[PDB]
Amino acid sequence: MREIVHIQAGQCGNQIGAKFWEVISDEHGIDPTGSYHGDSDLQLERINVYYNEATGNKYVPRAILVDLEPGTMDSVRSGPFGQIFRPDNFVFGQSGAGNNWAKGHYTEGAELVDSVLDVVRKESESCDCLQGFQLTHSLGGGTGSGMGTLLISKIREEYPDRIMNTFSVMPSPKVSDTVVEPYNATLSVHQLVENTDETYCIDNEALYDICFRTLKLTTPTYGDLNHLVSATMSGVTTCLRFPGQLNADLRKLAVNMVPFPRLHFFMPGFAPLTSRGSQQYRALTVPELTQQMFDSKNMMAACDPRHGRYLTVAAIFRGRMSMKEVDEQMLNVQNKNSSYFVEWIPNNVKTAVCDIPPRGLKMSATFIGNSTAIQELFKRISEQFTAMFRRKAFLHWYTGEGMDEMEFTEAESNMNDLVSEYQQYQDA
Amino acid sequence: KREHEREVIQKAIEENNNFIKMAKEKLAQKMESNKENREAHLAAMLERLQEKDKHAEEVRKNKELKE
Ligand SMILES: Nc1nc2c(ncn2[C@@H]2O[C@H](COP(=O)(O)OP(=O)(O)O)[C@@H](O)[C@H]2O)c(=O)[nH]1
Ligand SMILES: [Mg+2]
DSSP: OOEEEEEEEHHHHHHHHHHHHHHHHHHTTBOTTSOBOOSOGGGTTTGGGTEEEETTTEEEEOEEEEESSSHHHHHHHTSTTGGGSOGGGEEEOSSOOTTOHHHHHTSHHHHHHHHHHHHHHHHHHTOSSEEEEEEEEESSSSIIIIIHHHHHHHHHHHOTTSEEEEEEEEOBTTBOSOTTHHHHHHHHHHHHHHHOSEEEEEEHHHHHHIIIIISOOSSOOHHHHHHHHHHHHHHHHHHHHSOOSSOOOHHHHHHHHOSSTTOOEEEEEEESOOOSSSOOOSOOOHHHHHHHHTSGGGBSSOOOGGGSOEEEEEEEEESSOOHHHHHHHHHHHHHTTTTSBOTTSTTOEEEEEESOOOTTOSOEEEEEEEEGGGHHHHHHHHHHHHHHHTTTTTTHHHHTTTOOHHHHHHHHHHHHHHHHHHHHHHHO | OHHHHHHHHHHHHHHHHHHHHHHHHHHHHHHHHHHHHHHHHHHHHHHHHHHHHHHHHHHHHHHHTTO
């Protein structure tokens, strides 16, 4: 277990995907042409997790870029790190998916999926020992959502003993493209519950509110939202990418974070919260990091941690700091809040440290929580689904592609089951 | 699941084809029924005028058969 294969689908998927590669390439010393120009050995020791080595001697992301429309991917190609991607790994159709999960999953996506799997296969064949896959996508559109979940199901069929991991962007009325987002998200959640091992719930509601309430940006763009996403994504993958005292992979993450196979939707958090441009000079103390990383206002999923309990938590501290003081503060916050951590999983809070801080910071903390409070996210989507679905509003966009209302009823029931399955462990 | 996926796309094709088919036939029945109706309207008009030519033959007969 060395190689991860990365897939990015649709507009959101490709935009957050491109930003992730910009950030991690910078962290690993890699420049737009693929050349290493860094000064630490820690940068290269585990670089094979994400990068292929061409005889070059160039580093090529193990990344496949997928869309049903060309626009966003042309934008990736002419973007900052655009030239670094293997040009054969751009797989795109022409028609788009019209924010329609049925188009992505059943009609338009079906037409393109085999050629994506061909590219997946070529990368997988070149792997010493493939860990599994990470997908970036949103759940509210058509391609990332319908076609992304189609890909996952086809990847699982061909590689049933590999790990599937997603970064899944949840829609919010606060940052909304179409009214059909809750339909697309519910259909997609149904898929994620069955076919991923671990999913980071990146909630556009939370990203918006952080940008507005905390970063004091009166009118957040997608760019501002994505600044938070890429910082979080860098953070959560630190222990996959860098050598440390705990050497992690996608399977060990899943084993230790997921006590029941359906409850695999993580609430990520980050501290210190910053924006692009105006950044703080004031350094953070270990007690301040720890306090901030656990604050509701630092979570990337709009749920109140106090309305539930943590099943498991992984925490990663980056920068030169006292590991002794880290351990003390982490233990302090558990011992002073222990009603919020289930008592039937001993040692359910795990901390790891990496010396390399992210760009522009002296120290940072990244949070990965499996909390029963995530049920709030799913309940919110469920309410929005039902508000339309009770009158069958907007359904003709889906029945026109050959779907039946039964399939909506089934995906709704499965998502409601998930919610009450969370409620079950919040009491005991 | 692959079976279901096949059935969805096939349902989509079928409903689309049915729509095209129903549209083609409804239009053919309307254009035929219309052509017939218009023809019958004109045929009736011509028959009325034919009776006027027949009645005028009777009038010119009636004048001569006064002698
Ligand atoms: N955070 C974030 N959300 C996005 C971005 N682009 C689109 N979205 C969200 O993604 C959803 C629409 O899906 P999108 O990826 O545009 O459609 P697709 O290309 O058919 O997959 C909506 O919920 C949008 O708010 C982005 O760059 N960042
Ligand atoms: Mg879009």
